[PDB]
Design an enzyme around this catalytic site. Structure first.
Site, PDB file in Angstrom:
ATOM      1  N   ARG A 183      45.079   9.765  18.241  1.00  0.00           N
ATOM      2  CA  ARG A 183      44.495  10.471  17.101  1.00  0.00           C
ATOM      3  C   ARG A 183      42.986  10.213  16.993  1.00  0.00           C
ATOM      4  NH1 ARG A 183      47.331   6.086  15.117  1.00  0.00           N
ATOM      5  NH2 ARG A 183      45.858   4.478  14.387  1.00  0.00           N
ATOM      6  N   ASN A 184      42.504   9.168  17.643  1.00  0.00           N
ATOM      7  CA  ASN A 184      41.086   8.867  17.611  1.00  0.00           C
ATOM      8  C   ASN A 184      40.328   9.179  18.908  1.00  0.00           C
ATOM      9  OD1 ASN A 184      41.306   8.095  14.930  1.00  0.00           O
ATOM     10  ND2 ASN A 184      41.721   5.933  15.462  1.00  0.00           N
ATOM     11  N   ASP A 230      35.983   7.906  16.612  1.00  0.00           N
ATOM     12  CA  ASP A 230      36.194   6.922  15.559  1.00  0.00           C
ATOM     13  C   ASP A 230      35.314   5.689  15.763  1.00  0.00           C
ATOM     14  OD1 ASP A 230      37.253   5.555  13.347  1.00  0.00           O
ATOM     15  OD2 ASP A 230      38.755   4.543  14.599  1.00  0.00           O
ATOM     16  N   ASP A 249      40.553   0.395  16.714  1.00  0.00           N
ATOM     17  CA  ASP A 249      41.478   1.452  16.307  1.00  0.00           C
ATOM     18  C   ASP A 249      41.687   2.508  17.414  1.00  0.00           C
ATOM     19  OD1 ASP A 249      43.206   2.931  14.742  1.00  0.00           O
ATOM     20  OD2 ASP A 249      41.618   3.901  13.563  1.00  0.00           O
TER      21      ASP A 249
HETATM   22  O1  LIG Z   1      36.047  10.367  14.671  1.00  0.00           O
HETATM   23  N1  LIG Z   1      37.274  10.672  15.051  1.00  0.00           N
HETATM   24  O2  LIG Z   1      37.856  10.043  16.025  1.00  0.00           O
HETATM   25  C1  LIG Z   1      38.026  11.707  14.410  1.00  0.00           C
HETATM   26  C2  LIG Z   1      39.444  11.686  14.533  1.00  0.00           C
HETATM   27  C3  LIG Z   1      40.210  12.682  13.921  1.00  0.00           C
HETATM   28  C4  LIG Z   1      39.576  13.702  13.196  1.00  0.00           C
HETATM   29  C5  LIG Z   1      38.159  13.705  13.068  1.00  0.00           C
HETATM   30  C6  LIG Z   1      37.469  14.828  12.315  1.00  0.00           C
HETATM   31  N2  LIG Z   1      37.673  15.997  13.149  1.00  0.00           N
HETATM   32  C7  LIG Z   1      36.651  16.326  14.122  1.00  0.00           C
HETATM   33  N3  LIG Z   1      35.664  15.424  14.335  1.00  0.00           N
HETATM   34  C8  LIG Z   1      34.699  15.703  15.223  1.00  0.00           C
HETATM   35  C9  LIG Z   1      33.605  14.661  15.429  1.00  0.00           C
HETATM   36  F1  LIG Z   1      34.116  13.450  15.561  1.00  0.00           F
HETATM   37  F2  LIG Z   1      32.916  14.909  16.533  1.00  0.00           F
HETATM   38  F3  LIG Z   1      32.853  14.705  14.347  1.00  0.00           F
HETATM   39  N4  LIG Z   1      34.628  16.854  15.913  1.00  0.00           N
HETATM   40  C10 LIG Z   1      35.584  17.810  15.737  1.00  0.00           C
HETATM   41  N5  LIG Z   1      35.482  18.957  16.464  1.00  0.00           N
HETATM   42  C11 LIG Z   1      36.411  19.929  16.326  1.00  0.00           C
HETATM   43  C12 LIG Z   1      37.470  19.757  15.440  1.00  0.00           C
HETATM   44  C13 LIG Z   1      38.511  20.826  15.322  1.00  0.00           C
HETATM   45  C14 LIG Z   1      39.318  21.089  14.209  1.00  0.00           C
HETATM   46  N6  LIG Z   1      40.148  22.115  14.554  1.00  0.00           N
HETATM   47  N7  LIG Z   1      39.864  22.475  15.868  1.00  0.00           N
HETATM   48  C15 LIG Z   1      40.549  23.552  16.632  1.00  0.00           C
HETATM   49  C16 LIG Z   1      41.956  23.129  16.992  1.00  0.00           C
HETATM   50  C17 LIG Z   1      42.710  24.253  17.730  1.00  0.00           C
HETATM   51  N8  LIG Z   1      42.632  25.540  17.031  1.00  0.00           N
HETATM   52  C18 LIG Z   1      41.738  25.670  15.869  1.00  0.00           C
HETATM   53  C19 LIG Z   1      40.454  24.854  15.864  1.00  0.00           C
HETATM   54  C20 LIG Z   1      38.881  21.687  16.347  1.00  0.00           C
HETATM   55  C21 LIG Z   1      37.602  18.564  14.676  1.00  0.00           C
HETATM   56  C22 LIG Z   1      36.629  17.561  14.832  1.00  0.00           C
HETATM   57  C23 LIG Z   1      37.386  12.717  13.681  1.00  0.00           C
END
Ligand SMILES: O=[N+]([O-])c1cccc(CNc2nc(C(F)(F)F)nc3ncc(-c4cnn(C5CCNCC5)c4)cc23)c1
Length: 278
Positions: A142-143, A156, A138
């Site tokens: 977005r990931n 992801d 995937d």
């Molecule tokens: O595992 N993923 O690839 C994935 C993909 C899309 C969304 C997620 C969940 N979002 C996340 N997953 C993780 C992880 F994977 F390290 F746990 N770490 C994250 N760190 C920070 C943020 C985040 C959310 N808003 N922001 C800022 C954006 C600009 N202004 C306001 C705050 C940062 C989201 C995270 C995870």
């Protein structure tokens, strides 16, 4: 034990439950504070998995994930089993959130070179994963995450594997598999199997997302028709400001014969050269 080196003590972690920063199918993600071995407080992202027979599989997954290590691959900080019962996955905080949302944001001004550099970073992260014989399945903008230092982390995967944006996925009605149809290699659309070669197809789509700053691929070909569009030799078009050589690299990633596609080592070479010239 055997998972003890992955273990975080409860009194060493604060989860800021009022601050949801992400949501996937398998649970919410929260701001958190971890007290390291150094005795310093560090920012983390905490994953609360809601959904006992399957508990040992989670500890299993934590340790294998812990063994992966690379500048451009998401790292597992630790896991915390609490009294609540809901397993917690502890990951480093990613200041700029996911790469797609960072580039789509009209208040940001990433340069063409910035965008190419993000691409190179993923290529590097993906090179490391393919060497460990890991197939992502995937790969997409977005990931990938973007930390404070403009470092891209392929995410992801492992305990962080999930659907965070339902919009682009088909969920197979028989196997349960998530299928991000518009990032999928032709052969994957036909057989539902995934390889490093299909990861390479998807990296190509990812590059296109970078050079368009997060445009949706094939916005006017419906899901069903995607298979014949690709069988007809048609592909995504060169974005306006994508350098000709980089587009050539995209086209290579989308060759109908899987074996004919470049490897991530080869993609890192061609793209470093592009990144460093001009
Ligand atoms: O595992 N993923 O690839 C994935 C993909 C899309 C969304 C997620 C969940 N979002 C996340 N997953 C993780 C992880 F994977 F390290 F746990 N770490 C994250 N760190 C920070 C943020 C985040 C959310 N808003 N922001 C800022 C954006 C600009 N202004 C306001 C705050 C940062 C989201 C995270 C995870």
């Amino acid at each position: 034990q055997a998972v003890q080196h992955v273990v975080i003590g409860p009194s060493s972690l604060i989860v800021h439950f009022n601050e949801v920063i992400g949501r996937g199918h398998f649970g919410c993600v929260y701001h958190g504070t971890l007290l390291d071995n150094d005795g310093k407080k560090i920012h983390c992202a905490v994953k609360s998995l809601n959904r006992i027979g399957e508990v040992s599989q989670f500890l299993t997954e934590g340790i294998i994930m812990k063994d992966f290590s690379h500048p451009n691959v998401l790292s597992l900080l630790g896991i915390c089993l609490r009294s609540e019962g809901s397993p917690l996955v502890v990951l480093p905080y990613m200041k700029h959130g996911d790469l797609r949302n960072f580039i789509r944001n009209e208040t940001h001004n990433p340069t063409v070179k910035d965008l190419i550099g993000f691409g190179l970073q993923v290529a590097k992260g993906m090179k490391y994963l393919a060497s460990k014989k890991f197939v992502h399945r995937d790969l997409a903008a977005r990931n990938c995450m973007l930390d404070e230092k403009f470092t891209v982390k392929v995410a992801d995967f492992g305990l962080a594997r999930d659907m965070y944006d339902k919009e682009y996925y088909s969920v197979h009605n028989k196997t349960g598999a998530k299928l991000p149809v518009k990032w999928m290699a032709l052969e994957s659309l036909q057989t539902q199997k995934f390889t490093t070669k299909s990861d390479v197809w998807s990296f190509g789509v990812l590059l296109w997302e970078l050079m368009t700053r997060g445009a949706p691929p094939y916005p006017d070909v419906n899901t069903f028709d995607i298979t014949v569009y690709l069988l007809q030799g048609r592909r995504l078009l060169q974005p306006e400001y994508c350098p000709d050589p980089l587009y050539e690299v995209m086209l290579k990633c989308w060759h109908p014969k899987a074996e004919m596609r470049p490897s991530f080592s080869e993609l890192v070479s061609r793209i470093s050269a592009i990144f460093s010239t001009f």
